[PDB]
């Protein structure tokens, strides 16, 4: 299951990922690694923003 780092911009309840892991709950301004399938949709409705971690 692919993941990515995001900055969650709104208060967000805990949600379950496709990897059967629970992500969240998030307070506004939290940075977290979450499944990209969830993070993409959050970015789509402007609930989160991608952050690139240069490794």
């Amino acid at each position: 299951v692919p993941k990515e780092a995001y900055i969650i911009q709104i208060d967000l309840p805990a949600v379950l990922g496709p990897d059967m892991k629970e992500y969240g709950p998030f307070m506004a301004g939290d940075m977290a690694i979450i499944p990209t399938v969830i993070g993409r949709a959050l970015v789509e409705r402007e609930a989160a923003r991608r952050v690139r971690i240069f490794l």
């Binding site: 780092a5 900055i7 709950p25 939290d30 940075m31 979450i34 991608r50 952050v51 240069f54």
Partner: protein
């Protein structure tokens, strides 16, 4: 300092983190919102990601009983506090006993260790390290990260940014375990140490602003008076609009000599004079003229993001996110635009100020944000003063800030106690210091606030 005993705590803390990563557990990260705390948060975040692990970072104002409560409600497997938690060892063990706890901090701790087995205190102070010069919060996080993986040594510059923000080098040089971080960065070529003017404004400020904002050390007849800095630099043959980094090494050396002669003349303290030129940390990873190129400028940027409730945005910048730096720049510039507009509103609408016996009261409504209400009272003076503004977060609340001078403080007029006194009567939070304080109270009791505040002086 018994570095080997501290290193043992570092490895113990690092292994706990790595163990939970292997089990696929979410590494819950909590860190402070200043430069030292933001850099620390980024260091631990990258360390987790480097191991292919999952984290959730929160940048908070401080550790509170309310904060630990909602952290406990999350019921995580592991909590990691960075640049925080040393004064809340009892509180953490009380509410977070069910999980693994790692506290990476440099502040004087409540206990020298945790009572429970799954909780580890990574703190150099119980081993005899000076809290304010031997290692910062980011420094502790760096040590833990490096122990997780030696590749994390690429965060050496980031750690020093926090160290500078924590004023670990207020002496003019670095000391203790900070030197070990400095060396790691030198070996990787991601940071350099130069003997230059230790003032803020090396990258982004003109020479006359770098001298006017001069603190640690302060420059006599120049600090504060922005126009005098222009006059002084003109006479010495320098372009006041030019930036320090644009100077050749000969011109810097001449600027150092000129400033040093000036301070000796006006009887500047011997301690202050010795702190004018010292260690300045730069990084080849960034272009010169960029705020991230110098540690003090970088720390200043991060503090600004932290104060604007965008601490993780600053964290992202440390992680190398160029888009985040873009957003942060626009945000700060917008904040700058709000200031000059807020200060413009005070001058134009000073005809609506309540005349008081012991204090000034100005109500701006929703024109000035509650965050700008602090710097509003100062410029009203620079042209006691209390400015009131409507709460953006709330609705029936108004945020106020009280500012005064040394002349009024000489004749009593202690703002903090008086503001905290009225706040208790109006049923709201307040209080602060002696020359500066804040207060929140119901909006429908403004007329009552003016009356009670003057009487409390």
């Amino acid at each position: 300092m018994d570095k080997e005993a501290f290193l043992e705590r570092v490895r113990e803390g690092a292994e706990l983190i790595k163990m939970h990563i292997e089990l696929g557990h979410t590494i819950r990260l909590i860190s402070h919102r200043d430069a030292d705390g933001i850099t620390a948060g980024a260091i631990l975040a990258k360390a987790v990601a480097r191991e292919g692990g999952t984290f959730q970072l929160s940048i908070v104002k401080q550790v509170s009983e309310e904060l630990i409560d909602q952290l406990a409600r999350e019921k995580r497997e592991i909590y990691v506090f960075s640049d925080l938690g040393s004064g809340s060892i009892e509180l953490i063990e009380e509410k977070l006993n069910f999980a693994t706890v790692v506290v990476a901090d440099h502040h004087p701790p409540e206990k020298d260790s945790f009572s429970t087995d799954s909780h580890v205190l990574v703190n150099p102070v119980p081993f005899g390290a000076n809290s304010v010069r031997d290692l910062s919060g980011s420094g502790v996080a760096y040590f833990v990260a490096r122990e997780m993986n030696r590749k994390n040594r690429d965060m050496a510059y980031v750690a020093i940014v926090g160290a500078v923000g924590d004023m670990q080098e207020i002496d003019g040089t670095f000391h203790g375990l900070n030197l070990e971080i400095i060396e790691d960065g030198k070996e990787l070529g991601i940071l350099e140490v130069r003997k230059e003017l230790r003032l803020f404004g090396r990258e982004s400020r003109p020479l006359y602003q770098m001298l006017a904002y001069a603190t640690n050390p302060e420059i006599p007849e120049i600090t504060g008076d922005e126009r005098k800095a222009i006059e002084w630099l003109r006479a010495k043959g320098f372009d006041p609009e030019m930036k320090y980094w644009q100077l050749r090494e000969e011109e810097k050396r001449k600027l150092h000599e000129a400033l040093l002669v000036h301070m000796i003349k006006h009887g500047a303290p011997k301690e202050a004079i010795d702190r004018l030129i010292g260690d300045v940390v730069i990084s080849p990873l960034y272009p010169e003229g960029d705020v991230r190129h110098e540690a003090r400028e970088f720390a200043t940027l991060l503090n600004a993001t932290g104060r604007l409730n965008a601490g993780t945005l600053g964290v992202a910048i440390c992680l190398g996110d160029e888009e985040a730096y873009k957003v942060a720049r626009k945000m700060l510039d917008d904040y700058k635009k709000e200031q000059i507009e807020a200060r413009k509103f005070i001058i134009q609408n000073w005809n609506m100020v309540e005349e008081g016996e012991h204090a000034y009261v100005f109500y701006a409504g929703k024109n000035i944000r509650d965050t700008l209400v602090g710097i509003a009272a100062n410029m009203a003076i620079n042209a006691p003063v209390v400015v009131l503004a409507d709460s953006d977060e709330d609705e029936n609340l108004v945020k106020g800030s009280a500012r005064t001078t040394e002349k009024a403080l000489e004749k009593g007029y202690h703002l903090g106690e008086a503001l905290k006194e009225v706040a208790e009567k109006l049923g709201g939070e307040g209080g602060g210091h002696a020359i500066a304080a804040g207060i929140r109270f119901p909006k429908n009791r403004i007329d009552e606030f003016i009356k009670l505040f003057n009487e409390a002086l």
